[PDB]
């Protein structure tokens, strides 16, 4: 209960998950300084819901969970309850109750490669919307007319997964960027 | 009002390029996908190409691999036609067209057409 | 690529007999991606059939399709005044997309 929180293997981690596929740390019994996170000039973005983020430090909750994963930078804005968009609605949804923080920072220098990286993609496509917190990682072939694909591409029978091509040269706008958001259950 | 709106007249001398653009309206641009068809004056529809505007994965065909490509700006909701090396062959009008589409699902053909784009190539 | 052939080049009726239209395919093409497009001197391709057999919205009843597999027929009831024109097939299941080479339904006289 007296140690220090993992926080450094969650922000600092080598590689971090596509955003269809995003990572959850469980996080318990442990006691962080969260005023060097939002002193942060690293961190681009420090939005929290339901608790301030000038007044973190002096809340307690039974769990923490960290759940990480990339994005492009126009995407960010899409990581906060009630919002809508590919993002929002396809790959990670917040609930409208959310008790947390959604921090990110511009990971250019890390994830995007010259022709574009191939790592990282986003669900382009869905029957219907994602809970809040759903993960959808599945890989059928998206029928978006009457006529049933039958496993192959084509008109109107897309593959659900894109790659977001992250280029250094991209508009910042573009860029990849790594987010971490943080919940209090 | 489901439409789709191409560019005006382009006169382009030889071995320089055009770029014709499509815009769509009415309909969610994001989920459909434009392909392009030109036709000589007096001629048959040639298909140019295809491309998905939310992936903008593209297939073309054979004889237009070399010369053309095909983009969409869904900011602009706004789908392109890049031609490169114009010559005199490439003399025609241009065509656009897209399936109309709601937020998830799409028409089972290409129903909406663009009213056309003359390319004239010559010296 | 799948070859896509049209006949006849040119058709000529009087006003009021049925025509029949063909289309055919180098090979097996799936029902569900194929058109029929009527096109008018000076205008746009307009879509009339699609999925071999369903009527496009806005199309008269008087057209109708059929056919599978290589053979595909367009069928119009009664022609009109306003359907004298060029009409085109589509397969768009198999890329490259690829069309026929049109027939023109003209009148006898």
């Known amino acids: 209960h007296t140690n220090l929180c993992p926080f450094g293997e969650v922000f600092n981690a080598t590689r971090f998950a596509s955003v269809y596929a995003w990572n959850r740390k469980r996080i318990s019994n442990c006691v962080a300084d969260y005023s060097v996170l939002y002193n942060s000039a690293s961190f681009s973005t420090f939005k929290c819901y339901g608790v301030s983020p000038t007044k973190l430090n002096d809340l307690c909750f039974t769990n923490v969970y960290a759940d990480s994963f990339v994005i492009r930078g126009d995407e960010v804005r899409q990581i906060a309850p009630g919002q809508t968009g590919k993002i929002a609605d396809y790959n990670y949804k917040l609930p409208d109750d959310f008790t947390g923080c959604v921090i990110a920072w511009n990971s250019n220098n890390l994830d995007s490669k010259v022709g574009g990286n191939y790592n990282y993609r986003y669900r382009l496509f869905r029957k219907s919307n994602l809970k809040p917190f759903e993960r959808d990682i599945s890989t059928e072939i998206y029928q978006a007319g009457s006529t049933p694909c039958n496993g192959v591409e084509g008109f109107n029978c897309y593959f659900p997964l894109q790659s977001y091509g992250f280029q250094p040269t991209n508009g910042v706008g573009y860029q990849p960027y790594r987010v971490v958001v943080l919940s209090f259950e | 009002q489901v439409q789709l709106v191409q560019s005006g007249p382009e006169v382009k001398k030889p071995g320089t390029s055009v770029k014709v653009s499509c815009k769509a309206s009415?309909?969610?641009?994001?989920?459909?996908?434009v392909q392009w068809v030109r036709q000589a004056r007096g001629q048959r529809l040639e298909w140019i190409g295809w491309?998905?505007?939310?992936?903008?994965?593209?297939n073309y065909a054979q004889k237009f691999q070399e010369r053309v490509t095909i983009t969409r700006d869904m900011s602009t909701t706004t789908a392109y036609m890049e031609l490169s090396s114009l010559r005199s062959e490439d003399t025609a009008v241009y065509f656009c067209?897209?399936?109309?589409?709601?937020?998830?699902?799409?028409?089972?053909?290409?129903?909406?057409w663009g009213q056309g784009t003359m390319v004239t190539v010559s010296s | 690529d799948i070859q896509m052939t049209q006949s006849p080049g040119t058709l000529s009726l009087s006003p009021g007999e049925g025509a029949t239209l063909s289309c055919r395919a180098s090979?097996?093409?799936?029902?569900?991606?194929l058109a029929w497009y009527q096109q008018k001197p000076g205008q746009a391709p307009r879509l009339l059939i699609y999925?071999?057999?369903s009527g496009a919205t806005g199309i008269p009843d008087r057209f109708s399709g059929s056919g599978s597999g290589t053979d595909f027929t367009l069928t119009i009831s009664r022609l009109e005044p306003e359907d004298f024109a060029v009409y085109y097939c589509?397969?768009?299941?198999?890329?490259?997309?690829?069309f026929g080479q049109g027939t023109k339904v003209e009148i006898k006289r």
């Open positions: 067209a897209a399936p109309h589409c709601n937020s998830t699902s799409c028409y089972d053909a290409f129903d909406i």
């Open positions: 009415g309909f969610t641009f994001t989920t459909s996908a």
């Open positions: 491309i998905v505007v939310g992936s903008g994965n593209t």
């Open positions: 090979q097996s093409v799936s029902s569900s991606y």
């Open positions: 999925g071999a057999s």
């Open positions: 589509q397969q768009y299941g198999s890329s490259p997309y690829t």
